[PDB]
Amino acid sequence: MITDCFEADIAIPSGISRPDAAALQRCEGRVVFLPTIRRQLALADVAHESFVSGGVSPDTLGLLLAYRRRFPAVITRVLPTRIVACPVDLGLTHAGTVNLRNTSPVDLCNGDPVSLVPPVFEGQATDVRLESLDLTLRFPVPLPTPLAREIVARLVARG
Amino acid sequence: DVEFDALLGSYCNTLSLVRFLELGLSVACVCTKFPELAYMNEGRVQFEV
């Protein structure tokens, strides 16, 4: 359960409005970019204000470039006091099976590898904002790899 | 020829258990226990003024 699971526990603060707290109950299958593998973290280290540099929050093509400096993890259950995510690299669960959620506009298949991409699509950049805390959660998009290479390819060619 | 070594004895220390009540500072508290807190999300306190 250290090797099988790994319960990295994102703590939830005290002051969150019940419309904002119940907005996190629809954050089940997500991707959270943990900077380290600490067993106790805060939302500020998860939210986009951790991602921002000095004065500069980068664009979507740069938003890839510190995902791979971090540790993607998937939310397992949203308790009222905490949010638990197992890191992908260490160990998945007891049985080793976690559930995601298609925030894609794209249907998946069995057996295909799934790459996660920043919210690049139109009508899609939906960041669950904490109004009670002034925090945004830029949830990436799980995509099929025959798309997720082309979508990077269109962005690199655009620059 | 005869020689030896020795221990001239061991010394331990005693932790001092400190009850918060023993402190004079408990005057500022009023110490009451939730048998259950962790469940609580947002509690309020309400009293007439």
Binding site: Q25 | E36, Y39, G43, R44
Partner: peptide
């Protein structure tokens, strides 16, 4: 002749949520 009123603590808890997953409506008070 002083009047004493008991302090009132208002808090709400959802203990069963820990036992099981729940998706309560935001407006309603569990």
């Amino acid at each position: 002749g002083s009047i004493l009123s008991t302090i009132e603590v208002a808090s709400h808890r959802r203990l069963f949520d820990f036992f099981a997953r729940v998706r309560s409506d935001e407006n309603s008070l569990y």
